[PDB]
Amino acid sequence: RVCESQSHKFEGACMGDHNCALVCRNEGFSGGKCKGLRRRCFCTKLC
Amino acid sequence: RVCESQSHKFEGACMGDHNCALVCRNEGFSGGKCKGLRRRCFCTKLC
């Protein structure tokens, strides 16, 4: 089961899922991706 | 740090946040609330 949390560190429009994943790993998550028309980085991990 | 996961048990459209919270507690989360244009139940817990 997957849980999500918006990144605290990601700056600017999320244009590249991989960059978001890397920032999210620095925040303690397993990965992440960009979501929405607002292009925000959302970190993911197993609940 | 809070995380979110769409409910796996909640039936249909989410009207009452309290109902969603109780359903989500049965899924092992601390709470939950109805969100989105298509009113769905999202469970929350500390990650």
Side-chain angles (χ1 to χ4, degrees), chain B residues 4-26:
Chain B
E4 195 170 66
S5 186
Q6 194 184 312
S7 171
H8 289 187
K9 289 193 179 207
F10 194 95
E11 180 193 346
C14 195
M15 303 269 152
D17 287 348
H18 193 228
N19 305 338
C20 170
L22 278 188
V23 172
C24 288
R25 284 185 66 88
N26 178 268

Side-chain angles (χ1 to χ4, degrees), chain A residues 24-46:
Chain A
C24 284
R25 284 202 272 279
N26 173 290
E27 293 181 41
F29 290 83
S30 69
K33 67 173 293 266
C34 309
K35 297 179 79 193
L37 199 53
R38 287 167 83 189
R39 299 187 289 189
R40 290 177 297 175
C41 173
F42 283 85
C43 303
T44 53
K45 64 186 289 292
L46 265 356

Side-chain angles (χ1 to χ4, degrees), chain A residues 1-8 27 29 43 45 47, chain B residues 1-8 27 29 43 45 47:
Chain A
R1 181 153 186 174
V2 179
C3 277
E4 281 188 349
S5 185
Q6 192 182 339
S7 167
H8 289 205
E27 293 181 41
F29 290 83
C43 303
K45 64 186 289 292
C47 303
Chain B
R1 180 82 174 257
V2 67
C3 296
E4 195 170 66
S5 186
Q6 194 184 312
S7 171
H8 289 187
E27 298 176 51
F29 286 81
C43 301
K45 68 182 280 183
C47 262

Side-chain angles (χ1 to χ4, degrees), chain A residues 8-36:
Chain A
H8 289 205
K9 301 198 137 164
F10 196 91
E11 304 271 57
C14 193
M15 325 269 283
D17 290 340
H18 181 62
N19 305 324
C20 170
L22 293 173
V23 172
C24 284
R25 284 202 272 279
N26 173 290
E27 293 181 41
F29 290 83
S30 69
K33 67 173 293 266
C34 309
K35 297 179 79 193

